[PDB]
Coordinates of all heavy atoms in Angstrom, one line a residue:
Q2 N 26.3 1.6 4.9 CA 25.5 0.8 5.9 C 24.4 0.2 5.3 O 23.7 0.6 4.4 CB 25.0 1.7 7.1 CG 26.2 2.3 8.0 CD 26.6 1.5 9.1 OE1 26.6 2.0 10.2 NE2 27.0 0.3 8.8
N3 N 24.2 -1.1 5.7 CA 23.0 -2.0 5.2 C 23.1 -2.2 3.7 O 22.1 -1.9 3.1 CB 21.7 -1.5 5.7 CG 20.6 -2.5 5.5 OD1 20.8 -3.7 5.4 ND2 19.3 -2.0 5.7
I10 N 15.5 -3.9 12.6 CA 14.6 -3.8 13.8 C 15.3 -3.1 14.9 O 16.5 -3.5 15.2 CB 14.2 -5.2 14.3 CG1 13.5 -6.0 13.1 CG2 13.4 -5.1 15.5 CD1 13.6 -7.6 13.5
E16 N 15.1 6.7 27.0 CA 15.7 7.9 26.7 C 15.8 8.3 25.2 O 15.6 9.3 24.7 CB 17.2 8.0 27.3 CG 17.1 7.9 28.9 CD 16.8 6.5 29.4 OE1 17.1 5.4 28.8 OE2 16.5 6.5 30.7
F18 N 13.8 7.3 23.1 CA 12.3 7.4 22.6 C 11.8 8.8 22.7 O 10.7 9.1 22.4 CB 11.4 6.4 23.3 CG 10.5 5.7 22.4 CD1 10.9 5.2 21.2 CD2 9.1 5.5 22.8 CE1 9.9 4.5 20.4 CE2 8.2 4.9 21.9 CZ 8.6 4.4 20.7
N19 N 12.7 9.7 23.3 CA 12.1 11.0 23.5 C 12.0 11.9 22.3 O 11.0 12.6 22.1 CB 12.8 11.8 24.6 CG 12.6 11.3 26.0 OD1 11.5 11.0 26.3 ND2 13.7 11.2 26.8
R35 N 17.6 2.0 3.6 CA 17.9 1.3 2.4 C 16.9 0.1 2.1 O 16.6 -0.2 1.0 CB 19.3 0.7 2.3 CG 20.3 1.9 2.5 CD 21.7 1.6 2.1 NE 21.7 1.1 0.7 CZ 22.9 0.7 0.2 NH1 24.0 0.9 1.0 NH2 22.9 0.1 -1.0
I41 N 10.2 -0.7 14.7 CA 10.7 -0.1 16.0 C 9.8 -0.8 17.1 O 8.6 -0.6 17.2 CB 10.6 1.4 16.0 CG1 11.3 2.0 14.8 CG2 11.2 1.9 17.3 CD1 10.5 2.2 13.6
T63 N -17.7 4.1 6.2 CA -17.7 3.6 4.8 C -16.7 2.4 4.8 O -15.6 2.5 4.3 CB -17.2 4.6 3.8 OG1 -18.0 5.8 4.0 CG2 -17.5 4.2 2.4
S70 N -9.6 -9.3 -8.8 CA -9.7 -9.8 -10.1 C -8.4 -10.2 -10.6 O -7.4 -9.3 -10.4 CB -10.3 -8.8 -11.1 OG -11.5 -8.3 -10.7
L94 N -18.1 -9.1 12.9 CA -18.0 -9.6 11.6 C -16.7 -10.2 11.3 O -16.7 -11.4 10.6 CB -18.3 -8.3 10.6 CG -18.4 -8.7 9.2 CD1 -19.7 -9.5 8.9 CD2 -18.4 -7.4 8.3
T102 N -9.9 -15.7 10.5 CA -8.6 -16.4 10.3 C -8.8 -17.9 10.3 O -9.3 -18.4 11.3 CB -7.6 -15.9 11.2 OG1 -7.7 -14.6 11.6 CG2 -6.2 -16.4 10.8
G127 N -11.9 -1.3 7.3 CA -12.3 -0.1 7.8 C -10.9 0.8 7.7 O -10.4 1.0 8.7
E137 N -3.7 11.4 25.0 CA -3.1 12.7 24.9 C -2.0 12.8 25.8 O -1.0 13.6 25.5 CB -4.0 13.9 25.2 CG -4.6 14.0 26.5 CD -5.6 15.1 26.8 OE1 -6.0 16.0 25.8 OE2 -5.8 15.3 27.9
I150 N 4.2 18.1 8.2 CA 5.0 18.1 6.9 C 5.1 19.6 6.3 O 6.0 20.1 5.8 CB 4.3 17.3 5.8 CG1 4.2 15.8 6.2 CG2 4.9 17.4 4.4 CD1 3.2 15.1 5.5
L216 N 8.1 -4.0 -13.7 CA 7.3 -5.3 -13.6 C 5.8 -5.0 -13.6 O 5.0 -5.7 -14.3 CB 7.7 -6.2 -12.5 CG 6.9 -7.5 -12.3 CD1 7.1 -8.4 -13.5 CD2 7.2 -8.2 -11.0
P222 N -1.0 -4.4 -18.1 CA -0.6 -3.6 -19.2 C -1.8 -2.6 -19.7 O -1.5 -1.4 -19.9 CB -0.4 -4.6 -20.3 CG -0.9 -5.9 -19.9 CD -1.0 -5.9 -18.4
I239 N 1.0 -8.1 -6.3 CA 2.0 -9.0 -6.9 C 2.5 -9.8 -5.8 O 3.0 -9.2 -4.8 CB 3.0 -8.3 -7.7 CG1 2.5 -7.3 -8.7 CG2 4.0 -9.4 -8.3 CD1 3.6 -6.4 -9.2
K245 N 9.8 -13.0 -6.8 CA 11.1 -13.8 -7.0 C 11.3 -14.4 -8.3 O 12.4 -14.3 -8.9 CB 11.0 -15.0 -6.0 CG 11.2 -14.5 -4.6
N252 N 11.9 -7.6 0.6 CA 11.9 -8.2 1.9 C 10.5 -8.3 2.5 O 9.6 -7.6 2.0 CB 12.9 -7.5 2.8 CG 14.3 -7.8 2.5 OD1 14.7 -8.9 2.5 ND2 15.0 -6.8 2.0
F314 N 2.2 20.7 -1.8 CA 3.4 20.0 -2.0 C 3.7 20.0 -3.6 O 4.9 20.2 -3.9 CB 3.3 18.6 -1.4 CG 3.0 18.4 -0.1 CD1 2.4 17.2 0.3 CD2 3.2 19.4 0.9 CE1 2.1 16.9 1.6 CE2 2.8 19.2 2.2 CZ 2.1 18.0 2.6
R328 N -5.6 19.4 -12.8 CA -6.6 18.9 -13.7 C -7.1 17.6 -13.4 O -8.3 17.3 -13.4 CB -6.1 18.9 -15.2

Side-chain angles (χ1 to χ4, degrees), residues 2-3 10 16 18-19 35 41 63 70 94 102 127 137 150 216 222 239 252 314:
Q2 296 266 234
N3 193 23
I10 306 160
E16 295 76 19
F18 218 50
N19 284 322
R35 299 196 58 183
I41 307 92
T63 311
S70 299
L94 185 70
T102 319
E137 69 179 6
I150 299 158
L216 177 64
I239 305 162
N252 282 299
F314 304 157

